[PDB]
Amino acid sequence: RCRKNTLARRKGRHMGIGKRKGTANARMPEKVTWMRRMRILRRLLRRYRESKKIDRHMYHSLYLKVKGNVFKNKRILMEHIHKLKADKARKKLLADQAEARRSKTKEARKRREERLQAKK
Amino acid sequence: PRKIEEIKDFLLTARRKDAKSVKIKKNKDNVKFKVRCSRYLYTLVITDKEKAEKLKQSLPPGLAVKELK
Amino acid sequence: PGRGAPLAKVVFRDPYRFKKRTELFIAAEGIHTGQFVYCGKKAQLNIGNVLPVGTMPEGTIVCCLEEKPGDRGKLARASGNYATVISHNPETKKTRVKLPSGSKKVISSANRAVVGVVAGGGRIDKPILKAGRAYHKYKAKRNCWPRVR
Amino acid sequence: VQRLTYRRRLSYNTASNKTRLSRTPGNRIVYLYTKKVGKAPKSACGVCPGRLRGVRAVRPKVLMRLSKTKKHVSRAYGGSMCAKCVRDRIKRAFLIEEQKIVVKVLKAQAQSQK
Amino acid sequence: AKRTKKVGIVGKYGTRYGASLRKMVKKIEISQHAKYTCSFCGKTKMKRRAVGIWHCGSCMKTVAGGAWTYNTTSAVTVKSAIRRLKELKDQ
RNA sequence: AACUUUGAAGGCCGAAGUGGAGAAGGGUUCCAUGUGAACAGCAGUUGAACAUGGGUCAGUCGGUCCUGAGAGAUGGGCGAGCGCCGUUCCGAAGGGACGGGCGAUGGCCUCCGUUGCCCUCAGCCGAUCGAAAGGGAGUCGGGUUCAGAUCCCCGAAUCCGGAGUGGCGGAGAUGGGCGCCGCGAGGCGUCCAGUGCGGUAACGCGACCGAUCCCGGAGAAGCCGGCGGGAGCCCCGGGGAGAGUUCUCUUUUCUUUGUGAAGGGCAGGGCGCCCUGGAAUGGGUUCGCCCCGAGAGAGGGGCCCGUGCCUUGGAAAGCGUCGCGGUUCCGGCGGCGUCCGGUGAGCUCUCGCUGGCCCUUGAAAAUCCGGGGGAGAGGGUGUAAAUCUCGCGCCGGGCCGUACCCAUAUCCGCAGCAGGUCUCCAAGGUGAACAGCCUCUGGCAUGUUGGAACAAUGUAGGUAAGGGAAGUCGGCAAGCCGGAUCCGUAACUUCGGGAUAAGGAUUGGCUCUAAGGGCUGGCAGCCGACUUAGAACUGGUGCGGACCAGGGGAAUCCGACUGU
RNA sequence: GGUGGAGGUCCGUAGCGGUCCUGACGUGCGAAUCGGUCGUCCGACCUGGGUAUAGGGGCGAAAGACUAAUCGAACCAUCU
Ligand SMILES: [Mg+2]
Ligand SMILES: [Mg+2]
Ligand SMILES: [Mg+2]
Ligand SMILES: [Mg+2]
Ligand SMILES: [Mg+2]
Ligand SMILES: [Mg+2]
Ligand SMILES: [Mg+2]
Ligand SMILES: [Mg+2]
Ligand SMILES: [Mg+2]
Ligand SMILES: [Mg+2]
Ligand SMILES: [Mg+2]
Ligand SMILES: [Mg+2]
Ligand SMILES: [Mg+2]
Ligand SMILES: [Mg+2]
Ligand SMILES: [Mg+2]
Ligand SMILES: [Mg+2]
Ligand SMILES: [Mg+2]
Ligand SMILES: [Mg+2]
Ligand SMILES: [Mg+2]
Ligand SMILES: [Mg+2]
Ligand SMILES: [Mg+2]
Ligand SMILES: [Mg+2]
Ligand SMILES: [Mg+2]
Ligand SMILES: [Mg+2]
Ligand SMILES: [Mg+2]
Ligand SMILES: [Mg+2]
Ligand SMILES: [Mg+2]
Ligand SMILES: [Mg+2]
Numbered sequence A: 001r002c003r004k005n006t007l008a009r010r011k012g013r014h015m016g017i018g019k020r021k022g023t024a025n026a027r028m029p030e031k032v033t034w035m036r037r038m039r040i041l042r043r044l045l046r047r048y049r050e051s052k053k054i055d056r057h058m059y060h061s062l063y064l065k066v067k068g069n070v071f072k073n074k075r076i077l078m079e080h081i082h083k084l085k086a087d088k089a090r091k092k093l094l095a096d097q098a099e100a101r102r103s104k105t106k107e108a109r110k111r112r113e114e115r116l117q118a119k120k
Numbered sequence B: 001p002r003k004i005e006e007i008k009d010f011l012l013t014a015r016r017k018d019a020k021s022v023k024i025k026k027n028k029d030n031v032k033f034k035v036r037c038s039r040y041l042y043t044l045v046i047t048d049k050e051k052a053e054k055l056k057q058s059l060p061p062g063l064a065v066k067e068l069k
Numbered sequence C: 001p002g003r004g005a006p007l008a009k010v011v012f013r014d015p016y017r018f019k020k021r022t023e024l025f026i027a028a029e030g031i032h033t034g035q036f037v038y039c040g041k042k043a044q045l046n047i048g049n050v051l052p053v054g055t056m057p058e059g060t061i062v063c064c065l066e067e068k069p070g071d072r073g074k075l076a077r078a079s080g081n082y083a084t085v086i087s088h089n090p091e092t093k094k095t096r097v098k099l100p101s102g103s104k105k106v107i108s109s110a111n112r113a114v115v116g117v118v119a120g121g122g123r124i125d126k127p128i129l130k131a132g133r134a135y136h137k138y139k140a141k142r143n144c145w146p147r148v149r
Numbered sequence D: 001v002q003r004l005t006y007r008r009r010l011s012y013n014t015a016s017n018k019t020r021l022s023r024t025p026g027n028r029i030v031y032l033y034t035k036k037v038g039k040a041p042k043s044a045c046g047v048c049p050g051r052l053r054g055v056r057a058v059r060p061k062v063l064m065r066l067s068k069t070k071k072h073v074s075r076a077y078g079g080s081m082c083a084k085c086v087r088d089r090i091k092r093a094f095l096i097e098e099q100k101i102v103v104k105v106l107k108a109q110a111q112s113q114k
Numbered sequence E: 001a002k003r004t005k006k007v008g009i010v011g012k013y014g015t016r017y018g019a020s021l022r023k024m025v026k027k028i029e030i031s032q033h034a035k036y037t038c039s040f041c042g043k044t045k046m047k048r049r050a051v052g053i054w055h056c057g058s059c060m061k062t063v064a065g066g067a068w069t070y071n072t073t074s075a076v077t078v079k080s081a082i083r084r085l086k087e088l089k090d091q
Numbered sequence F: 001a002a003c004u005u006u007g008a009a010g011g012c013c014g015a016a017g018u019g020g021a022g023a024a025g026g027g028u029u030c031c032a033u034g035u036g037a038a039c040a041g042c043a044g045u046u047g048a049a050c051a052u053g054g055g056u057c058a059g060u061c062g063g064u065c066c067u068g069a070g071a072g073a074u075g076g077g078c079g080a081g082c083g084c085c086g087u088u089c090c091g092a093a094g095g096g097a098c099g100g101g102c103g104a105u106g107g108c109c110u111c112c113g114u115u116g117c118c119c120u121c122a123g124c125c126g127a128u129c130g131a132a133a134g135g136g137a138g139u140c141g142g143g144u145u146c147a148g149a150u151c152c153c154c155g156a157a158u159c160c161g162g163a164g165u166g167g168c169g170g171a172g173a174u175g176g177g178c179g180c181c182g183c184g185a186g187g188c189g190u191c192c193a194g195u196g197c198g199g200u201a202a203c204g205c206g207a208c209c210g211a212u213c214c215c216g217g218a219g220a221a222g223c224c225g226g227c228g229g230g231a232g233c234c235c236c237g238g239g240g241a242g243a244g245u246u247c248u249c250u251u252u253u254c255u256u257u258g259u260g261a262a263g264g265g266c267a268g269g270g271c272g273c274c275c276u277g278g279a280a281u282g283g284g285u286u287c288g289c290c291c292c293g294a295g296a297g298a299g300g301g302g303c304c305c306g307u308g309c310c311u312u313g314g315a316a317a318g319c320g321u322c323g324c325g326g327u328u329c330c331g332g333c334g335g336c337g338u339c340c341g342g343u344g345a346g347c348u349c350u351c352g353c354u355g356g357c358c359c360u361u362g363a364a365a366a367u368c369c370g371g372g373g374g375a376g377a378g379g380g381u382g383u384a385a386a387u388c389u390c391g392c393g394c395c396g397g398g399c400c401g402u403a404c405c406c407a408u409a410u411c412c413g414c415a416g417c418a419g420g421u422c423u424c425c426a427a428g429g430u431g432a433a434c435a436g437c438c439u440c441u442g443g444c445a446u447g448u449u450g451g452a453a454c455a456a457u458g459u460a461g462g463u464a465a466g467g468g469a470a471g472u473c474g475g476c477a478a479g480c481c482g483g484a485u486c487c488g489u490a491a492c493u494u495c496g497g498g499a500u501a502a503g504g505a506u507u508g509g510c511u512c513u514a515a516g517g518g519c520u521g522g523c524a525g526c527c528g529a530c531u532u533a534g535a536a537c538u539g540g541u542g543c544g545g546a547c548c549a550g551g552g553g554a555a556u557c558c559g560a561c562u563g564u
Numbered sequence G: 001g002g003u004g005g006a007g008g009u010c011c012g013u014a015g016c017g018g019u020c021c022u023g024a025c026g027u028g029c030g031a032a033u034c035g036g037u038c039g040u041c042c043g044a045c046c047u048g049g050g051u052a053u054a055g056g057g058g059c060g061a062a063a064g065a066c067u068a069a070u071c072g073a074a075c076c077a078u079c080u
């Protein structure tokens, strides 16, 4: 009889508003909920650090963001990681193109000054 | 109880004066030689039946041999 | 326990026998551990040092004072208290010292005292908020707290 | 569920009567009375909060049974003081003596000038 | 977030003991639990053990200081007077 | 034979028990046999009653030892006096031991012990008592009795003391140079060394001389919160063994499915332990914290607890079934099995880390160990010695208590008295819960008796149309509200509270949807958990359906309060 | 917006205590008990044992309360 009842409890039954005598903190406490969410998200950032996927600085910033209650789960945190990856990819591509243009300009100026000191 | 690894150390243990008796427990996949000294019960686990049969003839005649069953 | 002043285990070396002596000095405010507290007549005038009153100059803030030479410290040795040297007297070897009550006392110049104010000062500034704090105050000291009028 | 009783006449849950649960080969649960937890020795200096290493943390009258190497470490101040405070005490015992040598040389130079 | 307006550490006492008495307890109660920068190592580790005794977490070097603070102003003036008398004796 | 016993049925105590065990106390009340004279407020074939007999087995369990708060001798003081004060205070308060010298004895008078004298050395703290819950070395498993079991028996250990001639090994350990012989392997003669060895280090190895003295550690520490590890119990999916149900269904329901102490090894926790190295674009990291040029991350190591897994014990024994005996008196004999996994802020115990609180800082000694010192001993190259906390071997551990009750019947209350009395163990569901209710193990007969009717007054529960305090000194009593979720919450205030203010809505069942995770190789595969939110359908609007479980608001006086 | 868990903090189990029904009982279970309702339940909390204070004395968060069912001066014996 207990197994037949707890199968319905696993399905989501006999757990409505009426059959509930304790508070939410009594049933599933918010401290243990915070514990579970920290144990998930901290090891998630730890795996993404150890797999060479995120670096140490963005790791530390998103670690402080995990501590400061920004992300309620793992999915939007993965989406925020991939959005920062797209942003850093675009910024690194523009910075590398600007550095390549600057290096081309500096080497052209160096070769021009070399031709000037070779002629005169 | 102390488990002996070598055959020569078990023979030197059985040669001692404090050795009261030796008994042979023949279960499956093991043969256990137990010698009763004054302080410890020294045991020897042999996985080879031919090695156990060779060791059984190497007991001293003064020591009381008992095949436990 | 039962004392506002903190104490200090000061380890001395015995000059006659090979054995390290230990003493319970009243720690004045500013003494840390691993400090060399000197003691004698030819000692310097600084905090963490006991020297006789005839050697120290005018206006010296001292505590743990002796009323008589030899009794190991009797006067001005509660928490945050000090006695001050007013004036000396070379003839008859006497010294005026005023006490934290305000009384001026003629004390001989032979006896000694540690230099400074007693640590744990300002203890009476915080109010005891409740009967629990007063109960734990006097339970360590002695049975005098249930003051029935 | 096998509820089970003491095997002593001390019925109180005192620090002497500390227990653990253990299963016998006769298939029943019973108390085994635990030994009190001994601690490692603390340093003779008294500045380090940590305890010494290489020494078996056990109750003191057990140390008659332990061997010589089990109770200390093979070092000067072995089993009495930690190695950091040992090497700092060696440094201090060297440098105060060298300072005394420097003071003696300065006293000889003061006698040479005066 | 700022939780209370003008009551800090004394909010554990609730409505009890009076406003002026809690205001007098508040400054001392903050000063005895405020960790202080150690003069020896520099690390903010001066934790109060009991009355007049302060302890550094790094050096493990206990200092006999004030009851509720580390250095009292009277003890600072006493130390200044004692060093002045020491310099006047030494010359 | 209503009460005794057995079987069946129905119940209760419902794991903070009506269960199993202890302390104080009781003192044979414990167990067997017989009796129904007296007691057990009826009875009894029954009993804790009576009469015969039996029952308590320890180096390891306690006392015994130590000291606490304290008590109490000696010196001393006081007192007419029995005596009193006093516990380090007006004391020559030690009888101990290393080494050296001398004589006397005992043993193959070798070499050592015993004592006698002298020299020499020495601090201690107050004689003594004081805990069957404080400190305190070291025993567990199985079986056995009508009554005793960590005590008896068997099998495994372990603590302390002794150990002369040292009973056996191993350490102290046997190496080097020079000169000869020998083709060489190697063998002789002399000279010294040898109170251990290895690692950069944390430190390790099987020992690894050592006194008077000194230093240190253990003994030896509060309360609370949070987290993590490991056990015992509970839960789920299966394999086996036996039972329950099977008029219909159910790969279904119930029980069981193990391994001690003491060693060795390996997981698992902890480190304020060491080496390389020098870091801001600050980094590492916790539930919270916290850490860092006084050395962080990243690598390589070291130590402690290892009560957890494997192995010795040890399957022989224990347990669940099935079968043969002894016609009996029997640790009888034999087949099989005692298996594979996953989980959880789950309850209890324990270990460890980290914080908070104190005008509280949370015990001593017995006893044991380590180190610094270097007074002294050994032997001249060996059939070596002084010295061993190393592995074995031998002997001993004296004295007292041990049965039972431990509480609606073994204690105290004049008693089988609804009172009182200090602790441990702690299942399933429902539920926040160790609340209340039902059930499993265990226990019991309804509490100094039964039968027949259901009168009045009662005691304990309830229900009442309409009114709603008109009753009464007085809303006395009873009743209303009550859990949880979503809103919302005033005057006043010491701004902390009031506050669950007040005032509303929902709550059942069933069928779904969405969200909240690990292991392996933005993706794929394999698995384990309880919650939260939303929707539809439906029941005579019934749904915290029993149980659990705040009536509220506005004012006045007194006392601040918590407490007594 | 989170985390945190402080309080001589609130409801409330055990424990400690005993307001009200001036209920039961009142030649009682009881020379002070029982039922419901109640105060408190992390600290001025409860409690065993050891110990100390002895009668014009002790001790008392103070009621002349308690000091062995005896307290505005305990109990036993003597004067008697
Ligand atoms: Mg919270
Ligand atoms: Mg009092
Ligand atoms: Mg004890
Ligand atoms: Mg086991
Ligand atoms: Mg070691
Ligand atoms: Mg019982
Ligand atoms: Mg019983
Ligand atoms: Mg009987
Ligand atoms: Mg009768
Ligand atoms: Mg006396
Ligand atoms: Mg004694
Ligand atoms: Mg005792
Ligand atoms: Mg590091
Ligand atoms: Mg078997
Ligand atoms: Mg040495
Ligand atoms: Mg018994
Ligand atoms: Mg009865
Ligand atoms: Mg009931
Ligand atoms: Mg009845
Ligand atoms: Mg009956
Ligand atoms: Mg009506
Ligand atoms: Mg009506
Ligand atoms: Mg009226
Ligand atoms: Mg009422
Ligand atoms: Mg109100
Ligand atoms: Mg008015
Ligand atoms: Mg009041
Ligand atoms: Mg409270």
Ligand SMILES: [Mg+2]
Residues within 6 Å of the ligand: none
């Ligand atoms: Mg009445």
Ligand SMILES: [Mg+2]
Residues within 6 Å of the ligand: none
């Ligand atoms: Mg009547």
Ligand SMILES: [Mg+2]
Residues within 6 Å of the ligand: G029
């Ligand atoms: Mg009755």
Ligand SMILES: [Mg+2]
Residues within 6 Å of the ligand: G040
């Ligand atoms: Mg309350």
Ligand SMILES: [Mg+2]
Residues within 6 Å of the ligand: none
């Ligand atoms: Mg008197």
Ligand SMILES: [Mg+2]
Residues within 6 Å of the ligand: G061
């Ligand atoms: Mg009182």
Ligand SMILES: [Mg+2]
Residues within 6 Å of the ligand: none
């Ligand atoms: Mg009066």
Ligand SMILES: [Mg+2]
Residues within 6 Å of the ligand: G073
């Ligand atoms: Mg009178």
Ligand SMILES: [Zn+2]
Residues within 6 Å of the ligand: D043, D045, D046, D047, D048, D081, D082, D085
């Ligand atoms: Zn140290």
Ligand SMILES: [Zn+2]
Residues within 6 Å of the ligand: E038, E039, E040, E041, E042, E043, E056, E057, E058, E059, E060, E061
């Ligand atoms: Zn410091």
